[PDB]
Design an enzyme around this catalytic site. Structure first.
Site, mmCIF file in Angstrom:
data_model
loop_
_atom_site.group_PDB
_atom_site.id
_atom_site.type_symbol
_atom_site.label_atom_id
_atom_site.label_comp_id
_atom_site.label_asym_id
_atom_site.label_seq_id
_atom_site.Cartn_x
_atom_site.Cartn_y
_atom_site.Cartn_z
ATOM 1 C CB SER B 258 -0.932 -0.013 1.215
ATOM 2 O OG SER B 258 -0.266 0.387 2.380
ATOM 3 C CG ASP B 259 1.456 5.771 -1.384
ATOM 4 O OD1 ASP B 259 2.318 5.847 -0.509
ATOM 5 O OD2 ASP B 259 1.424 6.558 -2.346
#
Ligand SMILES: *[C@@H]1O[C@H](CO)[C@@H](O[C@@H]2O[C@H](CO)[C@@H](O[C@@H]3O[C@H](CO[C@H]4O[C@H](CO[C@H]5O[C@H](CO)[C@@H](O)[C@H](O)[C@@H]5O[C@H]5O[C@H](CO)[C@@H](O)[C@H](O)[C@@H]5O)[C@@H](O)[C@H](O[C@H]5O[C@H](CO)[C@@H](O)[C@H](O)[C@@H]5O[C@H]5O[C@H](CO)[C@@H](O)[C@H](O)[C@@H]5O)[C@@H]4O)[C@@H](O)[C@H](O[C@H]4O[C@H](CO)[C@@H](O)[C@H](O)[C@@H]4O[C@H]4O[C@H](CO)[C@@H](O)[C@H](O)[C@@H]4O)[C@@H]3O)[C@H](O)[C@H]2NC(C)=O)[C@H](O)[C@H]1NC(C)=O
Ligand SMILES: *[C@@H]1O[C@H](CO)[C@@H](O[C@@H]2O[C@H](CO)[C@@H](O[C@@H]3O[C@H](CO[C@H]4O[C@H](CO[C@H]5O[C@H](CO)[C@@H](O)[C@H](O)[C@@H]5O[C@H]5O[C@H](CO)[C@@H](O)[C@H](O)[C@@H]5O)[C@@H](O)[C@H](O[C@H]5O[C@H](CO)[C@@H](O)[C@H](O)[C@@H]5O[C@H]5O[C@H](CO)[C@@H](O)[C@H](O)[C@@H]5O)[C@@H]4O)[C@@H](O)[C@H](O[C@H]4O[C@H](CO)[C@@H](O)[C@H](O)[C@@H]4O[C@H]4O[C@H](CO)[C@@H](O)[C@H](O)[C@@H]4O)[C@@H]3O)[C@H](O)[C@H]2NC(C)=O)[C@H](O)[C@H]1NC(C)=O
Ligand SMILES: *[C@@H]1O[C@H](CO)[C@@H](O[C@@H]2O[C@H](CO)[C@@H](O[C@@H]3O[C@H](CO[C@H]4O[C@H](CO)[C@@H](O)[C@H](O)[C@@H]4O)[C@@H](O)[C@H](O[C@H]4O[C@H](CO)[C@@H](O)[C@H](O)[C@@H]4O[C@H]4O[C@H](CO)[C@@H](O)[C@H](O)[C@@H]4O[C@H]4O[C@H](CO)[C@@H](O)[C@H](O)[C@@H]4O)[C@@H]3O)[C@H](O)[C@H]2NC(C)=O)[C@H](O)[C@H]1NC(C)=O
Ligand SMILES: *[C@@H]1O[C@H](CO)[C@@H](O[C@@H]2O[C@H](CO)[C@@H](O[C@@H]3O[C@H](CO[C@H]4O[C@H](CO)[C@@H](O)[C@H](O)[C@@H]4O)[C@@H](O)[C@H](O)[C@@H]3O)[C@H](O)[C@H]2NC(C)=O)[C@H](O)[C@H]1NC(C)=O
Ligand SMILES: *[C@@H]1O[C@H](CO)[C@@H](O)[C@H](O)[C@H]1NC(C)=O
Lengths: 834, 832
Positions: B258-259
């Site tokens: 994920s960011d």
């Protein structure tokens, strides 16, 4: 109110000593000249009428080009493709006769190659009465002996290069405040005349006059008299300083020019001993002159004697031949007023032929080498706890302070250097030159780090303290740069009107050092400044491991410093003034308020000789860093002091001569075929009506009451007891004692020692020590050399006001030898000599 | 509102192609892991809890150290004694595959020696839909062929140096505005979810996806999913982009992280194809996680199938082994959070042993050389009216512009470069690195002039116009420096919230050029910027004799430029985007205002594939400087075009590796001190609900799990899938193209031959880039450039067939020096 006694007549040139041949030639040429021609030599042609900051018309019939006079004492002003040298205070910090000579010669070559005949420098006045005087930096040292030697060597370098040097400002221009009426008015002060320096005869001889005697003896061609008054008589018409001290006592054979706007009368000035009026007009472009026309007339109406004008001419031409200027002559090949290739010949009124006014001659040669060397050799290492030299192996280097970085307006982006932005390499006013470039400490130190693959940054906003603290914490060394500026009184920076308002670091400098020292255990302070600054709140900080004062280094500033920081140059410079704890410790306050109503402010020099280290010594005050103090990367030892006693003049002048003839007024009327250039000052009369063509409201008014007794007396005069030679009676220069000491490099690297020799002249009111001799000696590790000097009769004398002469008093005298004015491990009593 | 169709189940790894070995060793070690150990692989330990920007706790019992993930795409962020490389956009300007690779390798070495296991770059998303997009500079080019090749090259350089590269941001994060809810709030906008990029299927395949396919095919080991939605499903739980596009179609064998704050659900994201949660917590230091404990529970309670978490752990280990990280392992030897030598081992709560946290390891080696060279080879000569190279005999040189001088706060004086002061060598945000130093143009050019004994000055106040005009009248040459800056959305400079408010020169740049050119007949303009700027009001000034764009050159900026100005390097760089007359000429406006009430803003990519030059060509607009344009100090000739025609259906069932026991096996070990805010994989007790603390625990669970999400049975292989970066038939070479390139000038130098096709049809760009190279030719020297067109190169994506199709419209091929200078063209023969 202080008064200045008359001394007349104005002594005439006699071919004394080294001047013989120059004088013969001057005589032979002036003999051939008409009166208006002679006048032409004496008077500038008007503010910004020609190319140079001052310029005379010359004598075109006899093939004598106008004389071009340009600022400044540290490189050519208002020009292009010239060098910017370190300031004179840097020269003083080198304590190196040879560097002073070489800088003189490098400047002379450049001035010469621009078609400049006279350099308006070097300076030795101000001597340095007050550590906050705006112009001390232009000179050398508050010490007369150190100043005189380096003044004289600078003069010889310039003159051997074929340009007339001008010893300025003569005399007692010791502060900027109130030095000029219009200048004071612009600052909101109303004065009817300029500040008056009031000084006793003993003080003047033993301090302010002493370097001028060195200048005269070294053969200086020109002297520039000052804006101030001396005992309420203007510098450029003070017959006591000009006729008596300079011309009769010191035996000065060259010419006295006025400072620009310092000329205050035609007749009075001429009879009181002025020889040349600059820029020529009464005020800038007034199209009137105290001389020119007015002086032609003053000869015609009997008021100024022909012999006096003839003497002006002879002294001017003699200075010119003496340096061989005739052999190098060429019109000035640049204009001070514009950088344009083409323009009107006569700048101010935009008249005359439209023609080439700039040739863009590159005169710099390889002079960046002497500038770089000199900047390095004038870097005073004041403190060093085994911090310096840097090795190049420092992992991350923080360069901290605006004074490390660039002037964001460009190195020349403030007119006459009139700001303190980016690194301080040159202070402000007329004592300036356009930089061909300027190498900043930021550039030089960053390049050195990168050569060794280290990490490096420069922070140059002195209120970015947050970024300063953060970087300081990460750094292996913090190099903090700080400055204090000053300059001529016509420019005010931050409310500092020439003179500095205080001796505190500018641009938050103390806060910057603290912000760094509180975070790097290896904080190294570099100061650029015009003189001493208050170091009391941080110098003894446990994290400030080294401190350098580098003055005003000119164009190679950053490379001069890197040379010192990284050990290519072992620093050998010595403080040429005192670093005290407070402003108060120096005394000698500036006159900053009106203290004579709306009259001339009065500046009493009531300390007498007790300026700078002489005052600290008298008061038992302990400087932080004393006069003569400077560290090295090696150590030196002084031993074996020995003293050896050694075995060691007209009484009237001739009558005053006249050369050539004066004819009728009709001979000196404006020539019919000549277009008179607007604002241009000429020697010519409108008509044979003398009064009307003078246009002088006071013409023929009470004339004889306004001509002082003796002022027109052309008969033989007595030779003053202290006079009769060059820079005084030649007996003063008899060598009476030889001194010798062994100096040894006791450390691990080559370096220069600066042995210093003080004497104690004895007596209830004399300084405890005064400097007399010094040299700078290069020594390999373990090397020894015997340093030998001599003391002259002058060196051992005091000025006796009753005798009007230098006298060796009966108080016992001692010699002291060592490394500063407070570090004198060797002492010896002197035997009676006379 | 746009809608994102489901695609399930989330494909499992299968050891394809070059991944066979890494996958076998990954399966062998994961087989030995307990559930909580596997979960430790997938979840960060919380914001600023350990050393690196992202860090997992690893698997100590099996000697697998925690994985250290660190910014940036252009050098090590937040560290010390590291290098600062030129931006992505500079690599694009070089058009140089080999330089892209060497810059990857140099970075990989630096990251590796800091003990960093995963570099959070390079970037190819944003592609660069909008010229004022705030992060376009981090990536490469709005052209997908140029970007894909240089993106793949960078990834190979990093990964051959033993660090996992992370292709980011996947996908459509084409603007900073509204990219994050909390960020939008701080700028005064109330939105309930992040900006949604809404994009048709053909455009995504032909533009945004295409460089991710190259990244996948070149072996990238990680992908980072984006903060934005696509058709209103979050990038980090989008089953269509992650499961279908990335994993089933492109055959990605590595892991998706994920960011930071882009994780928005536990079960949903896991099932939709996410493999790693960064930085591990729900919000920074919330001490709560969508995964960690929650993911252990989701497996124990039967909602997330064991095979999905096994697969996450296999993808993550396969990547680590693929680059050989296990042979190079060492704990991170610096702290992102402090420069102090000593500190508490867990920075955020200041807990754990007080010990060494920085070792100050100097990893720079000789990387300044590649930096200097890449800065020179990326300096585009836009205009040269016979003014360059300089000879060093110029009598008086004016350097003009604050962009030439120092940052008065020191090169690193603005946090994450969040200012535009002094020379612009690095844009702002996470895409940054601490300079070890910064060579400014002023320093290098003045040193150059001094070496020849010239006169030189720098003026660095852009409003000091009086001083500028006085110097420019006296100068032989005026070198005027101007810039335009941008960055990541969490930083606002002069009101530019990430994205640029305009394409105009900052700091009075236009008026500075005009004041110089009004007085020097020899005014030379140097631009440092993140992208195109408007040059229209001075580029054709008769005293403007030359114009260069130097991008964002990193630490050696001044030496890079001086090498070009003084002829040590012949510029060969080519513009990687279009220089338009006006902002309007680019279309593709940012969404800057709320357009869906207080819901997520809707960013419709209504232009389709027509971005940058495709759009200019479509509207028949003439750029001042076209895509592909750059001048050289020599000339080249292109001739002799010759064309020549050249000669698995289901997956396995989802495997499980090792065993899951009872809840009691995963309760917190008794002797362990729990660091505060630290995210762990363990349960407070065997009570699942109370250990999760999820207010929705056990509620409507099956209705919130899309159909097929737990189907571990063999799946159909997609038509456009089956290989690495797509079906291998896509990479068959179908046509060979050759031309003769000659240097007809007097200076050795590089040509950049560019090959464009026209695929034909009413909706296709007139020309699209397909191949290029950078070829060094001495004066008079000739070479044959030969290259091949693949099946993919000649195809369009057919939404009905769900496949690449060579359409029946006749195609053309073009070769020349830019997208607008193409003297060689021919019809292509029909191929299929
Ligand atoms: C052939 O052609 C020639 C060229 O055309 C003709 O030359 C002209 O001759 C005139 C005389 O006929 C000259 O005019 C008079 O000049 C004097 C001198 O002025 C200057 O010097 C002043 C200081 O003087 C002392 O020192 C100098 C040397 O430095 C001596 O030469 C003087 O003798 C005098 O010496 C004494 O003092 C010193 C110590 O200081 C001692 O050592 C000596 O022992 C003596 O004791 C100086 O102060 C003057 O400064 C003023 O002028 C400046 C502008 O130029 C300005 O910057 C100053 O601020 C100051 O301004 C104030 O004064 C002026 C007028 O002078 C006002 O306009 C102004 O507004 C201010 O108030 C200058 O530098 C000058 O003193 C004379 O004026 C005095 O006397 C007249 C009456 O005769 C009064 O009207 C005046 O008010 C003034 O009065 C003061 O002094 C008196 C003392 O006598 C006193 O009684 C008063 O109370 C009062 O305070 C004349 O102005 C003219 O200069 C000259 N032109 C040129 C171009 O040379 C020549 O005439 C012709 N020949 C024939 C035969 O036809
Ligand atoms: C074993 O242990 C496990 C681990 O602990 C336990 O795990 C928990 O299980 C719970 C279910 O029991 C989970 O709770 C539910 O989560 C869902 C999904 O939330 C997330 O995704 C939303 C998008 O969903 C779609 O897409 C995803 C993939 O992206 C799919 O997985 C979904 O199936 C769904 O798919 C459809 O749509 C896509 C296209 O979009 C298609 O492709 C498909 O074909 C399908 O059509 C997303 O929008 C959610 O975003 C919210 O949450 C973020 C914070 O996380 C926030 O930033 C967002 O802004 C947004 O906030 C808003 O909503 C939340 C509530 O979710 C509010 O708190 C907040 O205030 C905001 O208003 C998210 O990322 C979720 O939708 C469920 O909630 C809905 O339904 C309940 C009723 O059950 C309502 O009370 C809610 O209000 C909400 O209703 C909305 O949707 C309804 C239809 O679904 C509609 O009817 C309503 O009108 C309304 O609009 C639950 O919250 C839980 O996440 C999970 N925990 C963990 C740690 O993983 C497990 O239970 C246990 N098992 C057993 C057997 O015990
Ligand atoms: C997911 O990832 C996370 C993050 O990576 C993992 O969390 C980490 O896991 C580690 C376990 O692998 C755990 O390590 C512990 O650290 C403690 C702190 O160490 C520091 O302080 C000490 C003390 O002054 C220094 O010695 C040391 O060098 C460090 O600076 C240690 O104290 C723990 O050491 C104990 O366990 C290890 C073996 O793991 C033994 O070698 C060591 O001798 C210690 O063993 C004693 O304690 C254990 C407790 O289990 C007993 O079993 C054993 O019999 C010994 O007990 C004696 O001593 C204890 C107290 O010392 C006494 O009460 C008892 O009565 C006996 O006398 C250990 O090294 C990390 O801290 C932890 N990190 C965080 C942030 O929480 C996690 O494991 C991962 N999860 C999975 C499934 O992989
Ligand atoms: C005192 O100093 C003054 C300044 O130096 C002297 O005045 C100058 O005197 C010279 C010599 O007399 C004059 O020269 C003349 O100039 C004119 C004009 O010159 C220009 O134009 C022509 C025509 O196209 C061109 O060919 C020339 O080369 C010039 O460019 C000539 O026509 C004459 O023949 C003559 O050469 C100066 O004009 C004059 N200067 C000023 C400012 O008035 C003065 O002579 C000196 N006085 C004494 C007594 O010596
Ligand atoms: C001399 O003549 C000029 C011009 O004819 C005149 O303007 C000037 O003022 C005169 N000088 C004097 C002192 O009268």
């Amino acid at each position: 109110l202080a008064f200045s006694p008359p001394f007349y007549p104005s002594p005439w040139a006699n071919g004394q000593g080294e001047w013989a041949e120059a004088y013969q030639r001057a005589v032979a040429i002036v003999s051939q000249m008409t009166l208006d021609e002679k006048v032409n030599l004496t008077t500038g042609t008007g503010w910004e009428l020609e190319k140079c900051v001052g310029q005379t018309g010359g004598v075109p019939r006899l093939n004598i080009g106008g004389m071009c006079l340009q600022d400044s004492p540290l490189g050519i002003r208002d020009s292009d493709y010239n060098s910017a040298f370190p300031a004179g205070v840097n020269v003083a910090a080198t304590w190196d006769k040879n560097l002073a000579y070489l800088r003189g010669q490098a400047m002379g070559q450049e001035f010469s190659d621009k078609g400049i005949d006279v350099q308006l420098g070097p300076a030795a006045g101000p001597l340095g009465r007050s550590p906050d005087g705006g112009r001390n930096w232009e000179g050398f040292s508050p010490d007369p002996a150190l100043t005189g030697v380096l003044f004289a060597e600078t003069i010889k370098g310039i003159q051997d290069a074929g340009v007339v040097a001008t010893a300025k400002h003569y005399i007692l221009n010791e502060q900027e405040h109130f030095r000029q009426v219009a200048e004071a008015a612009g600052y909101g002060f109303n004065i009817s005349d300029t500040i008056s320096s009031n000084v006793d005869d003993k003080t003047i001889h033993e301090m302010y006059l002493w370097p001028f005697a060195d200048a005269v003896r070294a053969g200086v061609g020109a002297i520039m008299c000052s804006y101030n008054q001396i005992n309420n008589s203007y510098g450029c018409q003070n017959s006591y300083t000009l006729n008596k001290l300079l011309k009769a006592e010191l035996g000065f054979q060259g010419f006295v020019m006025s400072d620009w706007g310092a000329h205050h009368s035609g007749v009075g000035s001429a009879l009181a001993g002025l020889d040349m009026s600059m820029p020529g007009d009464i005020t800038f472009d007034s199209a009137t002159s105290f001389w020119g026309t007015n002086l032609t007339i003053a000869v015609l109406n009997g008021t100024v004697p022909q012999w006096r004008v003839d003497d002006m001419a002879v002294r001017i031409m003699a200075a010119y031949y003496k340096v061989g200027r005739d052999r190098l002559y060429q019109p000035p090949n640049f204009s001070s007023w514009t950088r344009d290739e083409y323009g009107f010949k006569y700048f101010y009124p935009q008249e005359g032929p439209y023609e080439k006014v700039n040739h863009f001659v590159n005169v710099q040669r390889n002079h960046s080498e002497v500038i770089r060397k000199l900047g390095a050799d004038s870097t005073v290492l004041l403190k060093n706890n085994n911090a310096l030299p840097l090795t190049g192996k420092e992992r991350k280097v923080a360069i901290l302070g605006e004074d490390a970085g660039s002037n964001s307006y460009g190195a020349n982006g403030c007119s006459d250097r009139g700001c303190d932005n980016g690194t301080l390499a040159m202070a402000w006013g007329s004592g300036t030159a356009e930089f061909p470039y300027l190498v900043t400490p930021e550039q030089a130190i960053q390049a050195e780090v990168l050569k060794h693959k280290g990490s490096v940054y420069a922070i140059t906003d002195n209120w970015a303290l947050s970024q300063v603290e953060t970087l300081a914490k990460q750094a292996s060394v913090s190099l903090v740069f700080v400055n204090s500026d000053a300059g001529e009184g016509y420019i005010s920076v931050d409310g500092n009107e020439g003179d500095r308002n205080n001796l505190t670091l500018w641009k938050n400098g103390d806060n910057l050092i603290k912000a760094a020292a509180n975070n790097c255990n290896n904080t190294i302070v570099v100061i650029h400044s015009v003189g001493p600054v208050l170091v009391d709140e941080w110098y003894d900080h446990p994290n400030v491991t080294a401190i350098l004062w580098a003055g005003l280094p000119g164009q190679e500033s950053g490379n001069s410093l890197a040379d010192v920081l990284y050990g290519r140059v072992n620093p050998g410079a010595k403080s040429p003034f005192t670093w005290g704890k407070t402003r108060e410790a120096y005394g000698d306050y500036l006159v900053r308020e009106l203290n004579n109503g709306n009259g001339a402010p009065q500046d009493d020099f009531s300390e007498g000789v007790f300026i700078d280290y002489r005052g600290f010594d008298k008061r038992n005050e302990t400087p932080i860093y004393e006069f003569g103090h400077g560290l090295s990367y090696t150590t030196f030892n002084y031993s074996g002091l020995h003293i050896q006693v050694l075995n060691a003049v007209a009484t009237e002048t001739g009558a005053a001569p006249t050369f050539g003839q004066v004819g009728n007024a009709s001979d000196y009327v404006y020539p019919e075929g000549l277009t008179r250039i607007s604002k241009f000052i000429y020697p010519w009369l409108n008509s044979t009506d003398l009064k009307a063509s003078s246009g002088d409201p006071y013409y023929g008014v009470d004339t004889a009451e306004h001509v002082p007794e003796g002022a027109t007396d052309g008969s033989p005069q007595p030779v003053l007891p202290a006079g009769g030679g060059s820079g005084g009676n030649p007996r003063l220069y008899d060598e009476l004692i030889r001194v010798s000491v062994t100096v040894k490099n006791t450390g691990r690297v080559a370096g220069d020692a600066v042995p210093q020799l003080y004497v104690s002249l004895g007596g209830p009111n004399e300084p405890k020590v005064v400097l007399r001799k010094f040299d700078r000696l290069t020594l390999k590790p373990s090397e020894e050399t015997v340093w030998t000097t001599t003391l002259t009769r002058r060196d051992l004398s005091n000025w006796d006001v009753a005798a009007q002469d230098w006298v060796i008093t009966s108080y016992p005298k001692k010699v002291h030898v060592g490394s500063s004015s407070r570090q004198l491990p060797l002492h010896a009593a002197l035997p009676k000599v006379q």
